[PDB]
Ligand binder design. Structure first.
Ligand code: FE
Length: 331
């Protein structure tokens, strides 16, 4: 193996005990664990349980054991869990040092900073080091095919024909507005879906913030807000995920679109304004976002493309729960 930090690592002999240093790495692991999702997970960081309460609650009702997975508990205690392997994303510098001095192998994967470069390499690696190469090679082919449906068209489109796009990540509460993605993160999706991300040249990094005045002045063709907020939660933000209905999503999206300034945007007035589930920013399920983006960017060329079909297929083929809720929405 060569991991996403360029480190060389040795495939364990056996793996029955996996440590998830970033909780949302569960999403990648879920694609390899078939009907037994939590069986080999001895502990995890609590971002999956605390930030994706919706997906979690759906997993709990079919697997109540999940509440007893330890949350990364002193570092020392976690070493007692005797992990065969620890997976981390590109704060956890101490936990990593201890694990390495315990002769535990550590793998760094990535689906957040450089998703285009790394989503599939990340899956290929997890395939090998977790003894699930077929399920990985399967998801990879399924991902590639569902992305080719888009790139076959968008790869050939010249820059001057492409719509301008601004994506506001975690839109909501705009005393602090215009958090977005630049040369990476969801900008990779915009790139692949044949969009022109207005923030690509404003930002040095994958993630960052932009001034509202800069969005108003560019006045992009397309506006996207991301969110993963539960419906019953009067906090501001777009409400999407496994327990959100179409009607809850539109209602919450509309609240976001009606903020001072944002509501004057041409893209808002022309109804080229959309919502995407935030967690696609760190997940190999991101193919769904790429497809949602293409469909928004070029509605007719992708008229028959339905991300809901791809999602139902992904769940059918790889997961152990039923798809529910709303992961994207239109004005
Ligand atoms: Fe985040």
């Amino acid at each position: 193996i060569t991991d996403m930090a360029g480190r060389s690592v040795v495939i364990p002999a056996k793996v029955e005990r996996i440590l998830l240093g970033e909780g949302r790495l569960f999403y990648a692991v879920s694609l390899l664990e078939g009907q037994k999702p939590f069986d080999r997970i001895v502990g995890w960081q609590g971002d999956f349980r605390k930030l994706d309460t919706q997906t979690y609650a759906v997993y709990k009702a079919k697997f109540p054991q999940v509440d007893n997975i330890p949350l990364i508990i002193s570092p020392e205690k976690v070493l007692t869990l005797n992990p065969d392997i620890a997976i981390f994303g590109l704060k956890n510098s101490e936990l990593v040092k201890q694990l390495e001095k315990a002769g535990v192998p550590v793998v760094f994967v990535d689906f957040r900073t450089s998703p285009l470069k790394n989503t599939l390499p990340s899956m290929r690696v997890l395939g090998k080091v977790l003894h699930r190469e077929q399920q990985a090679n399967d998801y990879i082919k399924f991902y590639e095919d569902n992305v080719r449906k888009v790139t076959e068209i968008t790869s050939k489109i010249p820059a001057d024909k492409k719509p301008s796009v601004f994506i506001e990540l975690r839109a909501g509460a705009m005393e602090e507005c215009c958090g977005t993605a630049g040369k990476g993160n969801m900008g990779d999706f915009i790139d692949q879906a044949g969009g022109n991300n207005m923030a690509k040249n404003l930002l040095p990094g994958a993630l960052g913030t932009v001034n509202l005045e800069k969005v108003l002045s560019t006045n992009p063709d397309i506006y996207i807000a991301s969110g993963g907020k539960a419906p019953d939660n009067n906090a501001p933000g777009v409400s999407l995920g496994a327990q959100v209905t179409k009607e809850q999503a539109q209602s919450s999206l509309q609240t976001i679109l009606d903020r001072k300034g944002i509501n004057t945007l041409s893209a808002v007035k022309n109804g080229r304004s959309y919502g995407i589930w935030h967690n696609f920013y760190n997940s190999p399920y991101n193919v769904l976002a790429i497809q949602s983006f293409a469909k928004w960017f070029y509605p007719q060329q992708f008229a028959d493309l339905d991300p809901n079909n791809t999602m139902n297929s992904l769940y059918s083929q790889f997961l152990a729960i039923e798809p529910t809720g709303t992961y994207w929405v239109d004005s």
